[PDB]
Amino acid sequence: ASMRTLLIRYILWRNDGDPSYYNDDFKKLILFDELVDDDDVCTLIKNMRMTLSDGPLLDRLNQPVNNVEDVKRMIAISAKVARDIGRRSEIRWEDSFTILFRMIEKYFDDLMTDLYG
Amino acid sequence: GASMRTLLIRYILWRNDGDPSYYNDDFKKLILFDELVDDDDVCTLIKNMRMTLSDGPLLDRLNQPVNNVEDVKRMIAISAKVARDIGRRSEIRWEDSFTILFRMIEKYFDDLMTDLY
């Protein structure tokens, strides 16, 4: 419930890069970036620009999640796509969050352990 | 336009948890909308959410029609007051409330940026 709020704030901050909205709470989440190849991101961005939509990101977030590693990768690709699509992108972020949390809510306990245990 | 979506999410989340490390002066003009909302309409909504153990009544309030910028400011203000008064412990899927809020008020984002700036 802290996780829901934190991940929303984190993905919105990666989107706009406004440093008045930075928070040290994000530092441990930035470390998930190593799980994600920047060519998978570059391809997603190209597909979102070709479809003029979050469509391809929603498809990536609907891919199944089996463990905390898949969760960290799903948060990281959300974050990298949020940064690289640019602050002007009129994305319904609530639609991405709805799917992200449907897939990773089960693992919120396992994720708080990995971060703060 | 993308700015309004981000700002209103950050504002409603901040009213919910009251964490002062997430305060931003950008919220100051949104706090002014509070005068449009009677604290007895809020008290009734909170009571109905606690009696039903659900966001049900908030989702119903956000589904009431929006005809002008005034209705938008009132809808943002009641979201915000409910977020503060329901408490940080409340297991609310905030994305579900944002989905409805933005279905109703996205049309008026341009009129709302004018009013604010």
Q: CB–CB of A101 and B94 under 8 A? A: no
Domains annotated for chain A, with CATH where assigned, are 2-116 (1.10.437.20)
Experiment used for this model: X-ray
**Residue for token digits 């704030």?**
A9
Residue from B58, B106, B33 nearest A95 by CA: B106
What is the residue type of A48?
M
Q: How far apart are CA A69 and CA B26, in angstroms?
A: 36
Give whole-number Cα distances, B34 to A8, A21, B31, B73, B84, in Å: 24, 23, 6, 9, 12
B4 to chain A: nearest residue by CA?
Answer: A90
Q: CB–CB of B6 and A16 under 8 A? A: yes
Note the resolution in Å, 1 decimal: 2.6
Residue from A54, A22, A70 nearest B10 by CA: A22
Q: Which of A23, A89, A97 lies at the smallest CB-CB distance from B2?
A: A89
Return the structure tokens found at B106: 């996205």
Q: CB–CB of B9 and A87 under 8 A? A: no
Give whole-number Cα distances, B94 to A16, A45, A99, B97, in Å: 20, 26, 13, 5
Q: What is the DSSP string of B24-91?
A: -GGGHHHHGGGGGS-HHHHHHHHHHHHHHTSSHHHHHHHTS---SHHHHHHHHHHHHHHHHHH-TT--
